Design goal:
The structure is cut from a larger assembly and holds 3 copies of chain A, 1 copy of chain B (about 260 residues), 3 copies of chain C and 3 copies of chain D (about 40 residues).
Chain B lengths: L6 E5 L2 E5 L6 E2 L30 E2 L3 E4 L5 E5 L7 H9 E13 L7 E10 L25 E2 L30 E5 L5 E6 L16 E12 L7 E18 L8
Parallel strand pairs in B: 3-11
Antiparallel strand pairs in B: 1-2, 4-13, 5-13, 6-9, 6-12, 7-11, 7-13, 8-10, 8-12
Chain C lengths: L1 E5 L6 E2 L24 E2 L2 H4 L4 E2 L15 E4 L7 E6 L11 H6 L2 E5 L2 E7 L8 E7 L9 H5 L3 E5 L5 E6 L8 E2 L10 E6 L13 E9 L4 E5 L9
Antiparallel strand pairs in C: 4-14, 5-14, 6-13, 7-12, 7-15, 8-11, 8-14, 9-10, 9-13
Chain D lengths: L22 H4 L15
Classes of the chains: A mainly beta (about 270), B mainly beta (about 260), C mainly beta (about 230), D little secondary structure (about 40).
The structure holds 4-[(4,5-dimethoxy-2-nitrophenyl)acetyl]benzonitrile (2XK) (2 copies).
One 4-[(4,5-dimethoxy-2-nitrophenyl)acetyl]benzonitrile (2XK) binds next to β5 of chain A.
């Protein structure tokens, strides 16, 4: 099919393809056949695995949180006791997927979530309880749960999923951005104010995901850890940028740590060392 | 040469005229009609008194003062003692009907006031006692006198805070129901044509009120300097496409 | 037996899924449909009907007066009322529009705001309604207001003025939940000339304000409302 | 969209009505009113 | 496809579209193009998510109840001991779905139920029992269970479902109203009586759902909590009304609490405040 | 009921699989696409653009 | 192996469902039908036959 | 589809459908339209739920 | 409605008979009796 | 490839774009530059 290199022989002309001027801002498509004698070879390659659809198309962990099943008697702040918990939806908490997404400026896609819940009984327990988890999506404007047993968990309009601990939850969500694409970066503010926040933290008000355990308490305490995975599908990306070099310090902002190790390796020897 | 302002309505041997109306409303854009075979269930051949019951009946005038809260009537209840229509209501097991409601209120170009005139289908009232108290039959069957929203509560009766529509919803959204306003500076009358609205082809006309009519002052009444601080409000209702079914002995109702 | 592989998610109960399920009452014959007027197919149908706005929500408790906007005689260029345009909160929160809007996360489109004069027929007045698109503060005087979208209303035979609040935004959708980035701007009303009453007239004059959506309107991402609870 | 069950109640959601006529609520007046013409003539 | 706004320019005519008379009871379809100069824009929107089929088309919790597995020896009233329990079918017990349904006067649809049962062993237990739940529908006129082991649970004609605790039960039910639609409100009584009940409580005699645990008792006591979810499908709605403003106090009636907080927010300042 | 036999692997979550899944937001209508310059389809497109090499990384 | 997702309700026994099931007696040949008078197809057929009412249930 | 009751009016004949003799052992198919004035109505019902297949089918 | 099993007993419910003739029970008389005519002539 | 679900978001991955045009990044110059010809003429 496609040729990787054409057959090219000796050369002696005034057409010098290897002499350019990089200050123009262009990367002239020079080939090996332009500076050496080559033979014919074929690609036998389409580059399907480097398509943005494939690059962002696999599940990556985007959040880990914890909730627990125990007696709620006396507990004043259920949220703090972790009788139920929150997740202010965002994809820049765990760095692996974040660096990939931030290889672009604007990004548009549907999301496929997979939520894994694992039980743990650190203290004395006679058996492993069979708990059912309820993950409810709380869009901005919806009433937030205050107690693991609010009226809010009725979830009449909020979408929510019920699944066994140890099992996995799965569903997809359409592209919910308010604009035509999501912003990986935002050089702006919410309004013209002297103190207001800067960055995409201003655009990322996606709401929360409330997690709880439907079962009443058992004699012992059970610790359920929840892991949320995200896979993008039907991907579109715009304006590629320089890859993240320094470590992250916060969700949403480009801030980097003070006093960080150099990122570029230093030669063990000369600039002439191999 | 014609205008929404001037109108005539003739039903039976009764005719009302108005020279200061604001069009007229036909609930959900549907004119009343008789019950078609395809929708019928009751096998009894119905009775259609026509002109003897489909005519205008005028209720006692209410008095709008600077402190009125509003009034609420219920149909067919409000006409239970009105000529042959009323008689048919009690002598039959079933019946259905539509109406033409005409609320009247005139003042001068110096007065100011704005009445909301609305028709609410299935207006299930609430008990002022809260909890799970019911509202006794008598209190939702006031007859032509209707319910006065500025009167005090009474044991077994409904709550009457104009603000919560007697049912736990806000006054301001009453406009989602077929309505009209009588704004003294524009209006003189309000007219609403009501088609039969129910989840059954025909029903009991005594144990169930299909709609309630409310006349609520929104912008309070104000009269010119030194004038009588009140205006009368009159309600005239005419049934239409009335059908009665299952005739038997006369019904006896609570009190 | 057909070889299968169960995928993650198996067994889950997604309150939003839409699948088939066996009928617990096989062969049951439901009651025939009969005609019932007033059928509703889409919530976007009903939010186009306007309802009263409790603009004057300055009272100690809820009351009919909350819907009455006071207008004063012989006042000139002064402000009549003002409000931001977070339709999912403030004065709008209890209105049919606000109530329905709160059942969704996103909104877009144009709003229909109208005012109906109730003062005596022999009185006169000229007011000016103004919409101030996001980016600047709510106008502090008529001049400031008049510089943006506005309507000069002449009270007369036709009792109601209808000022549309044209969809003015960069991002094509705003949040129903009050959010700064997606703020909609401000709405204000002022005296263009003044309110004039006729002889023998001293009573207070009021305005009734309504809010509804234009066919322009759109709502997305259904969610629970903060307008009800128990537990 | 193959119906595995015998009864109608078993089938899934109906899909968009695609009717959308607000006029029976926004304009339930007897005499037609044209936008632009005097509301009260 | 559909235009959201047509292009409209300057205007100077005797046709004043923005001057109306709201006392007629109509909401004239005025557009932005009627009061300002506009450009052309398209909808790119169908409003599919606001269709009543979608609005009432998702599962909402409509009831929570409890039953338990324990020794029945000596217990006189099985129902009270919760050896088995009842649910007088109704959809106005939990307010979230109720407010939605009550946005309309008449409503017709098929129902898809999903019943979740979760176990709990508050006291000392050596293991988590593997209990099977039996939910039997008891239509008005059918004999009610008196003991968790009546002949009634034979359920020869009553439909009933058997499922494991921790698992979920699912099935749909056709529109069972006696009339052409269900009433969300009813300004009437059962008959012309001075003391009889008022409201839809008169029309809502849908029967009960009896729940029990088929297993005999174990050494310990197990508490099973049952949650019933309802999703409407093939929806039809009539006569829209004002939304519920005040809190509910009872199943079926419109009653509201005495001395309730105001529902309308009070301005922090003027009527001129932004 | 169609007779089936579940194969090994059933229940697993392979971060790399690519199957269908129910939408949690049925009937939601995403925002219209508008034109945005600089669209990238494949990473092989961008590695053809050259960047500076820190050859003298002797600091 | 065909990828599948089990829906809620899986495993339940709804006394009212109407599905297929394997026969425990394969190849069994049931006895031939013979004519028998008085066949009933619907209960609505028989309630049209009247029976005596114990009106005087005063004993 | 099927009619539940036909339209029937006044009657004055020698054909008396409501006078029978139950000692014959028969239940004459008398209808409301045989003793009262009726209007037309339809069944909108097949009686599928009372079929013996359904009755013993659960 | 694909039958996965070999035997007839395996198939699901039969579906409405749609016969419905009550006369063999309501009118099992030898001499036909016409509604309206003298039961005993 | 039978879509079991009603919404588009439910469907699986899109499959290779097969567009692959790097020039908008490698050669975003106003005046076309031919390989072999003087970069700066
Ligand atoms: C499964 O959990 C959910 C997550 C989300 C958030 C979402 O999909 C998203 C993805 C990427 C970006 C970017 N950049 C922003 C938001 C939504 N949601 O937004 O509606 C709902 C969820 O459960 C219905
Ligand atoms: C799953 O539990 C059941 C529930 C019901 C009640 C029902 O479907 C219903 C829905 C809405 C309205 C209204 N408004 C009234 C009744 C019935 N049932 O009525 O027969 C059977 C059930 O198990 C066979």
């Amino acid at each position: 099919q496609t040729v990787a290199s054409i057959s090219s022989g000796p050369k002696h002309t005034q057409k010098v393809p290897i002499l350019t001027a990089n200050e123009t801002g262009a990367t002239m498509p020079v080939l090996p056949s332009d500076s050496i004698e080559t033979r014919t070879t074929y690609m036998h390659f389409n580059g399907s695995e480097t398509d943005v659809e494939c690059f962002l198309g696999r599940a990556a962990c985007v959040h880990v949180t914890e909730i627990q099943n125990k007696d709620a008697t006396g507990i004043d702040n259920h949220r703090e006791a972790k009788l139920f918990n929150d997740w202010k939806i965002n994809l820049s908490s765990l760095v692996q997927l974040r660096k990939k997404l931030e290889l672009f400026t604007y990004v548009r896609f549907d999301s496929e979530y997979t939520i894994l819940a694992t039980a743990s009984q650190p203290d004395s327990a006679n058996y492993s309880s069979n708990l059912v988890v309820q993950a409810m999506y709380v869009p901005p404007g919806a009433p937030n749960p205050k107690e693991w047993d609010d009226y809010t968990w009725q979830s009449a309009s909020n979408p929510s999923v019920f699944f066994k601990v140890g099992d996995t939850s799965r569903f997809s969500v359409p592209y919910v951005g308010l604009a035509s694409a999501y912003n990986c970066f935002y050089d702006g503010y919410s309004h013209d104010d002297a103190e207001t926040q800067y960055g995409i933290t201003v655009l990322n008000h996606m709401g929360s995901m409330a997690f709880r355990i439907v079962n009443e308490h058992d004699e012992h305490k059970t610790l359920v850890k929840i892991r949320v995975y995200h896979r993008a599908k039907h991907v579109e990306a715009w304006i590629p940028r320089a890859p993240r070099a320094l470590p992250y310090t916060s969700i949403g902002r480009t801030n980097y740590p003070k006093n960080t190790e150099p990122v570029i390796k230093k030669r063990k020897g000369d600039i002439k060392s191999y | 040469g014609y205008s929404d302002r001037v109108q005539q309505i003739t039903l039976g041997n009764s005719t009302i005229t108005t020279q200061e109306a604001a069009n007229a409303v036909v609930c959900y854009a549907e004119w009343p009609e008789y019950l078609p075979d395809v929708d019928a269930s009751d096998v009894n051949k119905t009775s259609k008194p026509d002109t003897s019951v489909c005519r205008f009946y005028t209720l006692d005038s209410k008095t709008w003062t600077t402190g009125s809260k509003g009034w609420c009537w219920k149909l067919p209840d409000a006409l239970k003692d009105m000529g042959v229509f009323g008689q048919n209501m009690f002598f039959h097991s079933l019946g259905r009907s539509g109406y033409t409601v005409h609320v009247q209120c005139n003042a001068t170009k110096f007065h100011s006031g704005c009445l909301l005139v609305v028709v609410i289908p299935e207006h299930q009232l609430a008990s002022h006692e809260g909890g799970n108290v019911s509202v006794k039959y008598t209190f939702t069957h006031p007859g032509e006198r209707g319910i006065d929203l500025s009167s005090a509560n009474e044991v077994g009766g409904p709550v009457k805070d104009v603000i919560y529509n007697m049912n736990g919803t806000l006054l301001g959204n009453l406009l989602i129901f077929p309505h009209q306003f009588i704004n003294l500076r524009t209006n003189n009358t309000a007219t609403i044509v009501i088609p039969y609205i129910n989840s059954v082809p025909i029903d009991s006309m005594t144990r169930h009120n299909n709609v309630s009519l409310m006349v609520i002052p929104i912008a309070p009444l104000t009269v010119p300097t030194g004038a009588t601080p009140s205006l009368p409000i009159t309600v005239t209702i005419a049934p239409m496409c009335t059908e009665f079914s299952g005739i038997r002995s006369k019904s006896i109702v609570p009190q | 037996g057909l070889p299968t592989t169960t995928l993650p998610g198996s067994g889950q109960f997604l309150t939003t899924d839409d699948r088939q399920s066996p009928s617990a009452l096989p062969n049951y014959e439901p009651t025939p449909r009969i005609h019932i007027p007033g059928k509703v197919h889409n919530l976007l149908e009903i939010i186009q009907v306007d309802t009263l706005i409790p603009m004057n929500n300055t009272h100690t408790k809820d009351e009919v007066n909350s819907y009455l906007i006071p207008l004063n005689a012989n006042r000139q260029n002064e402000q009549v009322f003002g409000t931001n345009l977070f339709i999912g909160d403030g004065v709008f929160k209890t209105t049919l529009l606000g109530e329905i809007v709160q059942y969704y996360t996103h909104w877009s489109g144009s709003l229909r705001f109208s005012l109906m004069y109730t003062g005596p027929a022999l009185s006169s007045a000229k007011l000016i309604l103004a919409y101030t698109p996001p980016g600047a503060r709510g106008p502090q005087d008529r001049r400031e207001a008049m510089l943006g979208t506005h309507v000069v209303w002449d009270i007369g035979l036709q009792s109601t003025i209808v000022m549309t609040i044209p969809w003015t935004s960069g991002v094509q959708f705003r949040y129903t939940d009050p959010d700064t980035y997606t703020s909609a701007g401000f709405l204000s009303c002022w005296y263009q000339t003044s309110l004039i009453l006729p002889p023998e007239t001293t009573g207070q004059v009021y305005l009734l304000s309504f809010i509804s959506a234009c066919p322009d309107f759109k709502l997305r991402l259904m969610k629970d409302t903060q307008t009800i609870s128990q537990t | 969209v193959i119906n595995y069950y015998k009864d109608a109640a078993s089938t899934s959601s109906a899909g968009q009505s695609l009717s959308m006529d607000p006029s029976k609520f926004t304009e339930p007046v007897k005499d037609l009113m044209l936008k632009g013409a005097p509301a009260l003539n």
